[PDB]
Design a protein around this ligand. Structure first.
Ligand code: NI
Length: 341
């Protein structure tokens, strides 16, 4: 059945709740972003109103075939009325089209649902600054102090410099990047830009990227693999076997692969700086795991919450075990006593 942390009290609304069949009492289903654990259940047979960003609505229409009449895209940073309730969509700094949702309840309660987000000090100057938030439905993915990671800018600098050096030493090296969802497009687009190439990819993945309103995209991507020296593959093919296989398919155009796996977190982060990252190598194949995150680090999360000062926090991630739930609740109380709210 639908869990309580997916329901917005005082409304007929749910968030990211498409796999429970008809939710009793639901008048509008919000979708924060186009990731499968959140859209799970949508298809061309869905006949209830879906509220989302423009980009998420492009993916619903083109990838899932949801009928246009049930897609309700809203502009960001704009007061909108949905079934008599004021809402605002805010950029969540997650994947393309991902939003946070502000609900202004008829009784005067204000609720922020972060969806999935990577907290940023820029958020402290959005429409959030303008009123008090009483309840926070929080993306707690990395809510423990072991989770540190570098800025996205530092990670992309490392990837650009590594790729440019390799290909300049060996003009017959191929760069491969893994993907299994939207998000993290900066990794492959930045590397292709420094090398003067388009990114080559499957017809399915090209279609997906063409829904994202990315500026000048026709100039950066292609389905012609032969004309590209940065290839995108399924994350599952980023291993020695899969890459050896791919290299055979390129017909002797290349004699070396340098591959990137943008993971979330990996426990090399507790010890190792970005400067000191090294690949796994076999033969003429090297694989780099780079800590490019689209979720908050522990410190980023803590800063956002201590700035916002909510009266009540409802975690949305890691809620399945008592030990996780109790650990998170202890951090929330620490943050509140340190900051004085
Ligand atoms: Ni996500």
């Amino acid at each position: 059945t639908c869990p309580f942390y997916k329901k917005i009290p005082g409304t007929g609304f749910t968030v990211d709740a498409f796999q429970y069949g008809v939710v009793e009492g639901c008048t509008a289903y919000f979708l924060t972003h186009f990731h499968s654990d959140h859209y799970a259940g949508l298809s061309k047979h869905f006949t209830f109103p879906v509220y989302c960003s423009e980009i998420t609505g492009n993916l619903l229409k083109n990838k899932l075939h949801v009928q246009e009449q049930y897609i309700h895209p809203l502009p960001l940073d704009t007061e909108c009325i949905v079934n008599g309730v004021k809402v605002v969509l805010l950029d969540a700094n997650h994947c393309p089209g991902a939003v946070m949702i502000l609900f202004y309840l008829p009784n005067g309660t204000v609720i922020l649902h972060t969806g999935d987000f990577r907290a940023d000090p820029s958020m402290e100057r959005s429409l959030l600054a303008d009123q008090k938030v009483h309840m926070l439905y929080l993306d707690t993915t990395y809510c423990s102090p072991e989770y540190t990671f570098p800025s996205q800018q530092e990670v992309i600098r490392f990837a650009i410099n590594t790729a440019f050096e390799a290909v300049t030493l060996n003009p017959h090296a191929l760069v491969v990047c893994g993907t299994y969802s939207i998000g993290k497009e900066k990794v492959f687009l930045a590397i292709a830009d420094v090398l003067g190439s388009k990114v080559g990819m499957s017809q399915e993945k090209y279609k997906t990227l063409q829904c994202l309103n990315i500026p000048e995209i026709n100039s950066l991507i292609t389905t012609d693999m032969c004309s590209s020296l940065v290839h995108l593959l399924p994350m599952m093919q980023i291993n020695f076997k899969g890459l050896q296989s791919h290299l055979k398919k390129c017909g002797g155009k290349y004699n070396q692969i340098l591959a990137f796996r943008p993971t979330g977190w990996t426990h090399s982060n507790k010890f190792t700086r970005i400067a000191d990252v090294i690949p796994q190598t076999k033969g003429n194949i090297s694989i780099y795991g780079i800590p490019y995150s689209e979720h908050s680090s522990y410190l980023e999360m803590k800063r956002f919450v201590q700035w916002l000062k909510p009266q009540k926090i409802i975690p949305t991630v890691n809620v399945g075990t008592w030990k996780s739930r109790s650990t998170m609740e202890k951090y929330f109380r620490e943050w509140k006593l340190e900051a004085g709210y």
